[PDB]
Amino acid sequence: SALGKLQDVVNQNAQALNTLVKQLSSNFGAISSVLNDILSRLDPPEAEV
Amino acid sequence: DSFVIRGDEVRQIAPGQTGTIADYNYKLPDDFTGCVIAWNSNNLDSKVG
Amino acid sequence: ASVYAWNRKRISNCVADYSVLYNSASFSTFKCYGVSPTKLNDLCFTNVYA
C-alpha cells in the first residue's frame, strides 16, 4: 500500500469508465436498452419516444 | 384535400396510423400540421341501388 | 370459447406471414402495443400465444 495515491487515481478513472459503459445497459424507463431493438420493433412515432 | 371514405376509415386520416387508405390511398406525414374534417354524407353520397 | 374460459393455443415451430393479417380489411381493430404491425415479418419470436 505504499503507492496507494497513484493507484487510487487509476482505480477512480477506471471505475468512472466502467460506470459510464455500464449505464448503456439501462433502459431508463424505455422498453429496451438496445437501440436496434427499438428501431426494429416500433414505428418512428413511438420509437421516437 | 377532399375525398369520400367509409365511416370506420376516418381514423386512418392521421399521422402515425397503420391502415389501408393510409398506405395505398392518402398518407399524412408524421410532422403534419393542420386539421382533418369529417362529416356524415349518407344522404348525398349513397343510392338505394 | 367464452371469456371466462378463454382458449390459449401455443404457436411454435412455424413461419408466420402477418401480411395477410395486415392486408385483410375484415378486422375492425388491429392494434399492436409492444411492436409495430409492419415489423412483424422481419422479427423472430418464441412463446407465441393466441
Swiss-Prot record, chain A:
User: Which parts of the chain are coiled coil?
Assistant: 7-49
The protein's job, in short, is:
Subunit of the fusion protein that is processed upon entry into the host cell. Mediates fusion of the virion and cellular membranes by functioning as a class I viral fusion protein. Contains a viral fusion peptide that is unmasked after S2 cleavage. This cleavage can occur at the cell membrane by host TMPRSS2 or during endocytosis by host CSTL. In either case, this triggers an extensive and irreversible conformational change that leads to fusion of the viral envelope with the cellular cytoplasmic membrane, releasing viral genomic RNA into the host cell cytoplasm.
User: What protein am I looking at?
Assistant: Spike protein S2'
Specify the species.
Answer: Severe acute respiratory syndrome coronavirus 2 (2019-nCoV)
Tell me the lineage of the source organism: Viruses, Riboviria, Orthornavirae, Pisuviricota, Pisoniviricetes
Which part of the full protein is shown?
A: 943 to 991 of 1273
